[PDB]
Design a protein around this nucleic acid. Structure first.
Ligand SMILES: [Mg+2]
Ligand SMILES: [Mg+2]
Ligand SMILES: [Mg+2]
Ligand SMILES: [Mg+2]
Ligand SMILES: [Mg+2]
Ligand SMILES: [Mg+2]
Ligand SMILES: [Mg+2]
Ligand SMILES: [Mg+2]
Ligand SMILES: [Mg+2]
Ligand SMILES: [Mg+2]
Ligand SMILES: [Mg+2]
Ligand SMILES: [Mg+2]
Ligand SMILES: [Mg+2]
Ligand SMILES: [Zn+2]
Lengths: 38, 211, 142, 175
RNA sequence: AAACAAUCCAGACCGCCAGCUAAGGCCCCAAAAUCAUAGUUAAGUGGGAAACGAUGUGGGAAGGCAAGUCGGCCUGCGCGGAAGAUGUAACGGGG
RNA sequence: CAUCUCAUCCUGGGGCUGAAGCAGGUCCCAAGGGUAUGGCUGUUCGCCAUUUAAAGAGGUACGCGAGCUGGGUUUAGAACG
RNA sequence: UCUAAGCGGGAAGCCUACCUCAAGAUAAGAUUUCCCUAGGACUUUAUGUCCUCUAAAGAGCCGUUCGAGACUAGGACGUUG
């Protein structure tokens, strides 16, 4: 998980999510793309 | 937890067959007499009140005389309560007697007593404070406190600060001691180790709370 | 002629019971404090306690809006070097509902001997039953 | 809102009642329930459930679209249940249901056991395979996740406890 | 305006248990609307802070394709970015 | 003799890894407790020796002389460049 | 699609849990037991005053002292010891 101020898609398998007022990025292809805005 | 009230009689040793010496404290138990049973319906909680010892009738007030005569028991030297449950309040009735056979050899107990009083004591004894230089120019400051604060922030001494004052004479409980012997004909318990107080003071023995 | 003050010996406090089931906390507290001070009486005198007795029942059914049940904090300090203590609204309401009304209403009253004497006329109970059946309270629909 | 605005096919035997904000189903596998949100209406024909919004707002369509999707599963299950199957991969791992409590051996120093809840049942064809079967789909998924969480599958040799229809990432560890 | 020489209103000759207003205000502390009408916010935002990030949500002028769907601009109000030392402590408080 | 903060040194819980294992790197959560003795120099610091799970970073009049010391600096003597 | 409705797991941290204090907690709580049951006038007419009678349960002063103690407080005993 990368905790960043600027989170965004990286590949075509990145999905942008909103959980509990936190914007996240989840990727089902490779787990090194997980991002959390913080 | 139901227990016994006794008197600390002294400290001894017991050699075992393997030659090991075991330091032991002897506790004398005059069998306790049940003076009252408190229950949820009239008190709010379950307890067994107990007296032990003896008192001369010229030192028992008329109120305590009536309270002791309401049961069958004779007046003892103190009265004490034990918090219990039912399945522990099973066969206990006023005019009953609890003896040393409540315990067994190899049981773990807690013993509470009143420790010895040391009077007004300083920081070195009360809180293990360190002393200052003895001879390197030190003037009159050997067992003194040193600093007690800061400078105008916060501008006060904090609460719970460690200073000189009265030491000892409190209620102290020692957990985890073992029963070494239960002598029924002399009515004595012997436990392993040290217990708080002086010889002759009132101690309370009850099963261990940790288990 | 002149404006007369109410005599404490002529004051007559009355008894009322108010049910708190499903009610906003502060919008009830303002009414309770206004009744405790006596502002609803034409003999109101700011230096005299001409208020009324209030009984609150079902104190553990009082409500808050928004996210305050989890987010409203109650604080305390024991006056030891680090003794700040914190709790919730929802932990405190299922465990001590009397203190929530105590704080909410006492913050809305004066702060002095007469304010201490007014808060004594509020009686808060968690359940549906109170012990003051001999005083004959009225149902105040606040 | 395509999921709402559509009806579900209620076969015979299945029974639905609405005494309150509750809706309970009764078929052959068992009996279930579903509380409903305060902005949804329900109007069955005879075997055709109808979930509608009340006041027709943005939130009500979203609430009805799931009110439909979950009771569709309730009625889909009480007649024809649900089945999940887990596989154990790696030598030594083996599971065998002792009556109603599952005993797993997953490369530990102590034997693992899981006590199932009342709903789900679990059977054992061979050592390296478990099958759970139930009428509640949520509880079945929960039981599957709870058993999987013991030795979740690893990416270097694929060992562990897996779902059968589960895609496992895989790596090699050269230098 | 919590408290606050230099800000806002206003220039105290004395007395009154009379009346109208200014700045600022009208749920309680604490005087006066728990006033009326139409909207926005869900963040206690209001009641502290940037580059930048994002299918939050309301409004507007247009486009491409054939039960609609796609993504683009202009905008109202919000979200993240947001760590400090005695005690809550960045609405005076209750709320 | 202390007291607080967290931008966490150890211990506790995690995500990613160019993560086989053991051990690492990095980021997140976490302030409950703990967090060396010596040689040199007035030293704070620093270097070195030997330990430890670890030898954190800071605020408090660079905490603390109506609690102690007085080695440095910064009165009066004397000398060198 | 872990969240919008609904249902979970999860830390030396938080609340309990262990020890000690604690109803001046002025909201001053509870339980057992013990003690006090005489007459007259009288007017600022109400828990009103005045004069004889009475003096309980108990507490303290005092004494012998303590493994209790600065002084206190606290524990034991005072001839039936
Ligand atoms: Mg002594
Ligand atoms: Mg001197
Ligand atoms: Mg000396
Ligand atoms: Mg001050
Ligand atoms: Mg002013
Ligand atoms: Mg007013
Ligand atoms: Mg209105
Ligand atoms: Mg941190
Ligand atoms: Mg050194
Ligand atoms: Mg040497
Ligand atoms: Mg200094
Ligand atoms: Mg000097
Ligand atoms: Mg000179
Ligand atoms: Zn990706």
């Amino acid at each position: 998980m990368k905790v960043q101020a600027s989170v965004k898609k990286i590949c075509g398998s990145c999905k942008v999510i909103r959980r509990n007022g936190v914007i996240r990025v989840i990727c089902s292809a490779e787990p090194r793309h997980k991002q959390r805005q913080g | 937890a139901i227990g016994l009230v006794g008197r600390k009689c002294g400290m001894t040793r017991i050699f075992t067959d393997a030659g090991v010496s075991v330091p032991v404290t002897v506790i004398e138990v005059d069998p306790n007499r049940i003076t009252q049973i408190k229950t949820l319906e009239t008190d709010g909680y379950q307890a067994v009140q107990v007296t032990t010892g003896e008192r001369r009738e010229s030192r028992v007030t008329n109120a305590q005389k009536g309270h002791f005569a309401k049961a069958g028991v004779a007046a003892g030297r103190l009265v004490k309560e034990f918090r219990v449950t039912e399945a522990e309040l099973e066969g206990r009735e006023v005019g009953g007697t609890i003896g040393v056979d409540l315990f067994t050899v190899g049981q773990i107990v807690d013993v509470t007593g009143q420790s010895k009083g040391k009077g007004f004591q300083g920081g070195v004894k009360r809180w293990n404070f360190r002393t200052q230089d003895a001879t390197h120019g030190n003037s009159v400051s050997h067992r003194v406190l040193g600093s007690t604060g800061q400078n105008q922030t916060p501008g006060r001494v904090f609460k719970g600060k460690k200073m000189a004052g009265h030491l000892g004479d409190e209620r102290v409980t020692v957990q985890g001691l073992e029963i070494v012997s239960v002598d029924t004909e002399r009515s004595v318990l012997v436990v392993k180790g040290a217990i708080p107080g002086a010889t002759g003071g009132d101690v309370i023995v009850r099963p261990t709370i940790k288990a | 002629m002149k404006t007369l003050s109410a005599k404490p010996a002529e004051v007559q406090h009355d008894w009322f019971v108010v049910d708190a089931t499903g009610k906003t906390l502060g919008r009830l507290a303002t009414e309770i404090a206004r009744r405790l001070r006596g502002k609803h009486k034409t003999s109101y005198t700011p230096h005299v306690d001409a208020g009324d007795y209030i009984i609150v029942i079902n104190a553990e059914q009082v409500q808050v809006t928004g996210n305050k049940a989890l987010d409203k904090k109650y604080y305390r300090h024991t006056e030891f070097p680090g003794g700040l203590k914190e709790t919730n609204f929802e932990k405190l309401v299922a465990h001590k509902p009397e203190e929530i009304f105590e704080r909410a209403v006492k913050g809305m009253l004066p702060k002095g001997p007469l304010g201490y004497a007014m808060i004594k006329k509020m009686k808060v109970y968690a359940g549906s039953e109170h012990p003051h059946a001999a005083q004959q309270p009225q149902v105040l629909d606040i | 809102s395509r999921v709402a605005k559509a009806p579900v096919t209620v076969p015979n035997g299945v029974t639905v009642t609405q005494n309150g904000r509750q809706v309970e189903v009764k078929g052959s596998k068992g009996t279930l329930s579903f509380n409903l949100h305060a902005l949804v209406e329900l109007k069955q024909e005879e075997g055709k459930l109808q979930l509608a919004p009340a006041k027709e707002s943005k939130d009500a369509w979203m609430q009805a679209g799931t009110a439909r999707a979950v009771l569709n599963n309730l009625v889909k299950g009480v007649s024809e249940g649900f089945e999940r199957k887990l596989q154990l991969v790696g030598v030594g791992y083996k599971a065998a249901v002792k009556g109603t409590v599952v005993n797993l051996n997953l490369g530990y120093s102590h034997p693992i056991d899981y006590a199932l809840p009342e709903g789900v049942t679990a059977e054992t064809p061979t050592a390296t395979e478990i099958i759970l079967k139930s009428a509640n789909k949520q509880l079945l998924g929960q039981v599957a996740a709870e058993i999987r969480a013991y030795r979740s599958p690893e990416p270097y040799k694929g060992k562990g406890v897996r779902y059968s229809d589960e895609v496992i990432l895989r790596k090699e560890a050269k230098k």
